[PDB]
Design an enzyme around this catalytic site. Structure first.
Site, PDB file in Angstrom:
ATOM      1  N   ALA A  10      18.877   9.626  -2.689  1.00 23.87           N
ATOM      2  CA  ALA A  10      18.185   9.493  -3.956  1.00 23.87           C
ATOM      3  C   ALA A  10      16.743   9.973  -3.869  1.00 23.87           C
ATOM      4  O   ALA A  10      16.170  10.045  -2.781  1.00 23.87           O
ATOM      5  CB  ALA A  10      18.199   8.019  -4.393  1.00 23.87           C
ATOM      6  N   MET A  12      12.752   9.535  -4.982  1.00 23.33           N
ATOM      7  CA  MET A  12      11.802   8.468  -5.354  1.00 23.33           C
ATOM      8  C   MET A  12      10.495   9.047  -5.872  1.00 23.33           C
ATOM      9  O   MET A  12       9.851   9.874  -5.205  1.00 23.33           O
ATOM     10  CB  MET A  12      11.520   7.602  -4.125  1.00 23.33           C
ATOM     11  N   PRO A  13      10.046   8.640  -7.055  1.00 21.19           N
ATOM     12  CA  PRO A  13       8.760   9.164  -7.520  1.00 21.19           C
ATOM     13  C   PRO A  13       7.628   8.788  -6.579  1.00 21.19           C
ATOM     14  O   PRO A  13       7.528   7.622  -6.179  1.00 21.19           O
ATOM     15  CB  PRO A  13       8.608   8.488  -8.885  1.00 21.19           C
ATOM     16  N   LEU A  17       3.646   2.289 -10.404  1.00 21.19           N
ATOM     17  CA  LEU A  17       2.722   1.258 -10.880  1.00 21.19           C
ATOM     18  C   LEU A  17       2.938  -0.031 -10.117  1.00 21.19           C
ATOM     19  O   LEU A  17       4.029  -0.596 -10.029  1.00 21.19           O
ATOM     20  CB  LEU A  17       2.978   1.057 -12.384  1.00 21.19           C
ATOM     21  N   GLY A  18       1.866  -0.549  -9.536  1.00 24.20           N
ATOM     22  CA  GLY A  18       1.930  -1.873  -8.947  1.00 24.20           C
ATOM     23  C   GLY A  18       1.781  -3.000  -9.953  1.00 24.20           C
ATOM     24  O   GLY A  18       1.147  -2.798 -10.986  1.00 24.20           O
ATOM     25  N   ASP A  43       6.626  -0.961  -9.118  1.00 25.36           N
ATOM     26  CA  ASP A  43       6.788  -1.828  -7.972  1.00 25.36           C
ATOM     27  C   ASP A  43       6.632  -3.297  -8.358  1.00 25.36           C
ATOM     28  O   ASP A  43       5.603  -3.687  -8.925  1.00 25.36           O
ATOM     29  CB  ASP A  43       5.743  -1.475  -6.905  1.00 25.36           C
ATOM     30  N   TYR A  48       5.629 -12.288  -7.445  1.00 23.27           N
ATOM     31  CA  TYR A  48       4.517 -11.915  -8.329  1.00 23.27           C
ATOM     32  C   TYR A  48       4.566 -12.730  -9.632  1.00 23.27           C
ATOM     33  O   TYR A  48       3.601 -12.765 -10.394  1.00 23.27           O
ATOM     34  CB  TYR A  48       4.484 -10.416  -8.666  1.00 23.27           C
ATOM     35  N   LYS A  77      11.512  -6.966  -4.291  1.00 22.80           N
ATOM     36  CA  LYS A  77      11.436  -7.434  -2.908  1.00 22.80           C
ATOM     37  C   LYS A  77      11.958  -8.863  -2.762  1.00 22.80           C
ATOM     38  O   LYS A  77      11.708  -9.661  -3.672  1.00 22.80           O
ATOM     39  CB  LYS A  77       9.980  -7.383  -2.409  1.00 22.80           C
ATOM     40  N   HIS A 110      10.481  -8.359   1.881  1.00 19.12           N
ATOM     41  CA  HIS A 110       9.076  -8.325   1.476  1.00 19.12           C
ATOM     42  C   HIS A 110       8.151  -8.479   2.684  1.00 19.12           C
ATOM     43  O   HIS A 110       7.162  -7.762   2.740  1.00 19.12           O
ATOM     44  CB  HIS A 110       8.858  -9.416   0.437  1.00 19.12           C
TER      45      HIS A 110
HETATM   46  N1  NAP Z   1       4.600  -5.230  -0.059  1.00 18.56           N
HETATM   47  C1  NAP Z   1       3.613  -6.076  -0.070  1.00 18.56           C
HETATM   48  O1  NAP Z   1       3.390  -6.949   0.748  1.00 18.56           O
HETATM   49  C2  NAP Z   1       2.439  -5.727  -0.998  1.00 18.56           C
HETATM   50  C3  NAP Z   1       1.161  -6.282  -0.754  1.00 18.56           C
HETATM   51  C4  NAP Z   1       0.073  -5.944  -1.614  1.00 18.56           C
HETATM   52  C5  NAP Z   1       0.316  -5.059  -2.698  1.00 18.56           C
HETATM   53  N2  NAP Z   1       1.629  -4.564  -2.872  1.00 18.56           N
HETATM   54  C6  NAP Z   1       1.940  -3.681  -4.075  1.00 18.56           C
HETATM   55  O2  NAP Z   1       0.924  -2.669  -4.147  1.00 18.56           O
HETATM   56  C7  NAP Z   1       0.293  -2.679  -5.473  1.00 18.56           C
HETATM   57  C8  NAP Z   1      -1.141  -2.124  -5.422  1.00 18.56           C
HETATM   58  O3  NAP Z   1      -1.878  -2.980  -4.478  1.00 18.56           O
HETATM   59  P1  NAP Z   1      -2.938  -4.039  -5.022  1.00 18.56           P
HETATM   60  O4  NAP Z   1      -2.477  -4.681  -6.285  1.00 18.56           O
HETATM   61  O5  NAP Z   1      -3.129  -4.963  -3.840  1.00 18.56           O
HETATM   62  O6  NAP Z   1      -4.300  -3.270  -5.244  1.00 18.56           O
HETATM   63  P2  NAP Z   1      -4.814  -1.799  -5.635  1.00 18.56           P
HETATM   64  O7  NAP Z   1      -3.850  -1.024  -6.403  1.00 18.56           O
HETATM   65  O8  NAP Z   1      -5.365  -1.268  -4.387  1.00 18.56           O
HETATM   66  O9  NAP Z   1      -6.071  -2.265  -6.531  1.00 18.56           O
HETATM   67  C9  NAP Z   1      -5.882  -2.861  -7.798  1.00 18.56           C
HETATM   68  C10 NAP Z   1      -7.334  -3.168  -8.307  1.00 18.56           C
HETATM   69  O10 NAP Z   1      -7.963  -1.907  -8.653  1.00 18.56           O
HETATM   70  C11 NAP Z   1      -8.367  -1.799  -9.995  1.00 18.56           C
HETATM   71  N3  NAP Z   1      -8.165  -0.438 -10.417  1.00 18.56           N
HETATM   72  C12 NAP Z   1      -7.026   0.279 -10.710  1.00 18.56           C
HETATM   73  N4  NAP Z   1      -7.238   1.506 -11.112  1.00 18.56           N
HETATM   74  C13 NAP Z   1      -8.612   1.609 -11.075  1.00 18.56           C
HETATM   75  C14 NAP Z   1      -9.395   2.723 -11.428  1.00 18.56           C
HETATM   76  N5  NAP Z   1      -8.937   3.903 -11.835  1.00 18.56           N
HETATM   77  N6  NAP Z   1     -10.764   2.534 -11.292  1.00 18.56           N
HETATM   78  C15 NAP Z   1     -11.307   1.329 -10.857  1.00 18.56           C
HETATM   79  N7  NAP Z   1     -10.543   0.240 -10.537  1.00 18.56           N
HETATM   80  C16 NAP Z   1      -9.164   0.437 -10.661  1.00 18.56           C
HETATM   81  C17 NAP Z   1      -7.470  -2.780 -10.716  1.00 18.56           C
HETATM   82  O11 NAP Z   1      -8.116  -3.290 -11.890  1.00 18.56           O
HETATM   83  P3  NAP Z   1      -7.369  -3.569 -13.330  1.00 18.56           P
HETATM   84  O12 NAP Z   1      -5.973  -3.968 -13.066  1.00 18.56           O
HETATM   85  O13 NAP Z   1      -8.299  -4.645 -13.929  1.00 18.56           O
HETATM   86  O14 NAP Z   1      -7.493  -2.235 -14.137  1.00 18.56           O
HETATM   87  C18 NAP Z   1      -7.290  -3.936  -9.665  1.00 18.56           C
HETATM   88  O15 NAP Z   1      -8.413  -4.801  -9.706  1.00 18.56           O
HETATM   89  C19 NAP Z   1       0.449  -4.183  -5.853  1.00 18.56           C
HETATM   90  O16 NAP Z   1       0.172  -4.477  -7.180  1.00 18.56           O
HETATM   91  C20 NAP Z   1       1.882  -4.435  -5.381  1.00 18.56           C
HETATM   92  O17 NAP Z   1       2.728  -3.838  -6.367  1.00 18.56           O
HETATM   93  C21 NAP Z   1       2.705  -4.858  -2.064  1.00 18.56           C
HETATM   94  O1  ZST Z   2       2.989 -10.182  -0.616  1.00 16.53           O
HETATM   95  C1  ZST Z   2       2.486  -9.447  -1.516  1.00 16.53           C
HETATM   96  O2  ZST Z   2       3.092  -8.495  -2.049  1.00 16.53           O
HETATM   97  C2  ZST Z   2       1.016  -9.606  -1.746  1.00 16.53           C
HETATM   98  C3  ZST Z   2       0.592 -10.995  -1.353  1.00 16.53           C
HETATM   99  N1  ZST Z   2       0.006 -11.057  -0.220  1.00 16.53           N
HETATM  100  N2  ZST Z   2      -0.435 -12.306   0.191  1.00 16.53           N
HETATM  101  C4  ZST Z   2      -1.080 -12.166   1.495  1.00 16.53           C
HETATM  102  C5  ZST Z   2       0.113 -12.416   2.475  1.00 16.53           C
HETATM  103  N3  ZST Z   2       0.061 -12.255   3.771  1.00 16.53           N
HETATM  104  C6  ZST Z   2       1.282 -12.557   4.412  1.00 16.53           C
HETATM  105  C7  ZST Z   2       1.574 -12.492   5.784  1.00 16.53           C
HETATM  106  C8  ZST Z   2       2.860 -12.839   6.165  1.00 16.53           C
HETATM  107  C9  ZST Z   2       3.251 -12.784   7.618  1.00 16.53           C
HETATM  108  F1  ZST Z   2       4.331 -11.997   7.757  1.00 16.53           F
HETATM  109  F2  ZST Z   2       2.348 -12.165   8.361  1.00 16.53           F
HETATM  110  F3  ZST Z   2       3.540 -13.912   8.200  1.00 16.53           F
HETATM  111  C10 ZST Z   2       3.844 -13.233   5.289  1.00 16.53           C
HETATM  112  C11 ZST Z   2       3.599 -13.316   3.948  1.00 16.53           C
HETATM  113  C12 ZST Z   2       2.293 -12.959   3.553  1.00 16.53           C
HETATM  114  S1  ZST Z   2       1.695 -12.955   1.953  1.00 16.53           S
HETATM  115  C13 ZST Z   2      -0.313 -13.483  -0.502  1.00 16.53           C
HETATM  116  O3  ZST Z   2      -0.697 -14.589  -0.094  1.00 16.53           O
HETATM  117  C14 ZST Z   2       0.374 -13.384  -1.760  1.00 16.53           C
HETATM  118  C15 ZST Z   2       0.554 -14.553  -2.526  1.00 16.53           C
HETATM  119  C16 ZST Z   2       1.201 -14.430  -3.731  1.00 16.53           C
HETATM  120  C17 ZST Z   2       1.649 -13.201  -4.164  1.00 16.53           C
HETATM  121  C18 ZST Z   2       1.474 -12.075  -3.433  1.00 16.53           C
HETATM  122  C19 ZST Z   2       0.826 -12.141  -2.197  1.00 16.53           C
END
Ligand code: NAP
Ligand code: ZST
EC number: 1.1.1.21
Length: 315
Positions: A10, A12-13, A17-18, A43, A48, A77, A110
């Site tokens: 598949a 993937m774009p 959007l987060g 995403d 969340y 996730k 996740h």
């Molecule tokens: N897998 C995981 O463990 C994990 C962990 C962390 C994040 N994620 C995913 O990654 C996504 C993105 O990461 P993130 O939410 O941590 O942070 P990010 O995308 O690095 O930063 C979001 C911050 O930046 C601001 N922003 C966005 N566009 C901007 C622009 N053009 N100019 C200035 N500020 C801007 C947003 O403000 P506004 O919203 O007020 O516009 C918000 O405060 C998450 O939402 C989530 O979907 C996954």
């Molecule tokens: O998770 C998101 O997407 C963003 C995210 N990050 N974190 C920081 C984290 N740090 C971790 C470290 C571990 C570890 F594996 F290291 F133990 C496990 C789990 C986590 S959550 C949060 O605490 C959190 C709380 C609510 C919703 C989203 C998040």
């Protein structure tokens, strides 16, 4: 191009959007706006707490025939309290019901760490330590493979897995589906060169989260570095007549990564999508890489004793 081929066949774009921290009462309009201006990848995650509201947006744009389901790439996730074999399918189905979908394009583990099941996302003991579950990433993975065989998800992957943890899955006895994606924190202050090369060399696509440094993270401190305000990055943007955020998004794209900037601000959702009409130079790219400081935005103290904590390992 705008999409990257996954090892499940598949596409993937590479821009999505987060949705973490997007308030429930603003995320529906954010996702509607994002789909109107071009986004096709959202995403999401159960943890969340806004998948129902994201789902309302997806469904209204499917209903309005702004997009077809096959054009969308929806990611969610499996949260840490559902790693048990027995709990994984129900968790998926709750996310599918909230998102108003009958399949996910990609479902991720996740975090590598399983936590005790229950209503609390972060179950703690009386001294503040997260209570682990005795599940291991290999049996959780098998549970994820079953979701593929049941038609609930088209691809499965991992998130926040370190190189030894990816390798554990790749070396799983009886492995049926390889992970398609590893989604990890990645920006100029945390460039992740070693982990990205490892994953790409294994045909695993890397998605970069917090690409703007997550300035709205709840635990942010004023003393913290700020990517968006780094004048060196501003200078590079200014060279290309783009914003710093636009440089920060374009940078992982040119490393063959997928990137998922979060915003709920319509002007910024639109701005963040205008990253297909300019390129950074190879020199720009190495200069951005040189800002690495191994500074990580996403971790959590209370989890550091978990046997599966991913960030003691160098990479
Ligand atoms: N897998 C995981 O463990 C994990 C962990 C962390 C994040 N994620 C995913 O990654 C996504 C993105 O990461 P993130 O939410 O941590 O942070 P990010 O995308 O690095 O930063 C979001 C911050 O930046 C601001 N922003 C966005 N566009 C901007 C622009 N053009 N100019 C200035 N500020 C801007 C947003 O403000 P506004 O919203 O007020 O516009 C918000 O405060 C998450 O939402 C989530 O979907 C996954
Ligand atoms: O998770 C998101 O997407 C963003 C995210 N990050 N974190 C920081 C984290 N740090 C971790 C470290 C571990 C570890 F594996 F290291 F133990 C496990 C789990 C986590 S959550 C949060 O605490 C959190 C709380 C609510 C919703 C989203 C998040």
């Amino acid at each position: 191009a705008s999409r990257i081929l996954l090892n499940n066949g598949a596409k993937m774009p590479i821009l999505g959007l987060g949705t973490w921290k997007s308030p429930p009462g603003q995320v529906t309009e954010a996702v509607k706006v994002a789909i109107d201006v071009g986004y096709r990848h959202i995403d999401c995650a159960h943890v969340y707490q806004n998948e129902n509201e994201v789902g309302v947006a997806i469904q209204e744009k499917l209903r309005e025939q702004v997009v077809k389901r096959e054009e969308l790439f929806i990611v969610s996730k499996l949260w840490c309290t559902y790693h048990e074999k027995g709990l994984v399918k129900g968790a998926c189905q709750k996310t599918l019901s909230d998102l108003k979908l009958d399949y996910l394009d990609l479902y991720l583990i996740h975090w590598p760490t399983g936590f005790k099941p229950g209503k609390e996302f972060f179950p703690l003991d009386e001294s503040g330590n997260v209570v682990p579950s005795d599940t291991n990433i290999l049996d959780t993975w098998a549970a994820m493979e079953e979701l593929v065989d049941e038609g609930l998800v088209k691809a499965i992957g991992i998130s926040n897995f370190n190189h030894l943890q990816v390798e554990m899955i790749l070396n799983k006895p009886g492995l049926k589906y390889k992970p398609a994606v590893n989604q990890i924190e990645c920006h100029p202050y945390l460039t992740q060169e070693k982990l990205i090369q490892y994953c790409q060399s294994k045909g695993i696509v890397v998605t970069a989260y917090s690409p703007l440094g997550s300035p709205d993270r709840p635990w942010a401190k004023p003393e913290d570095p700020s990517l968006l305000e780094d004048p060196r990055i501003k200078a590079i943007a200014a060279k290309h007549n783009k914003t710093t955020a636009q440089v920060l998004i374009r940078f992982p794209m040119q490393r063959n990564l997928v990137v998922i900037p979060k915003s709920v601000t319509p002007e910024r959702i639109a701005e963040n999508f205008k990253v297909f009409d300019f390129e950074l130079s190879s020199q720009d790219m190495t200069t951005l890489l040189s800002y690495n400081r191994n500074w990580r935005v996403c971790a959590l103290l209370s989890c550091t004793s978990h046997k599966d904590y991913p960030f003691h390992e160098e990479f």
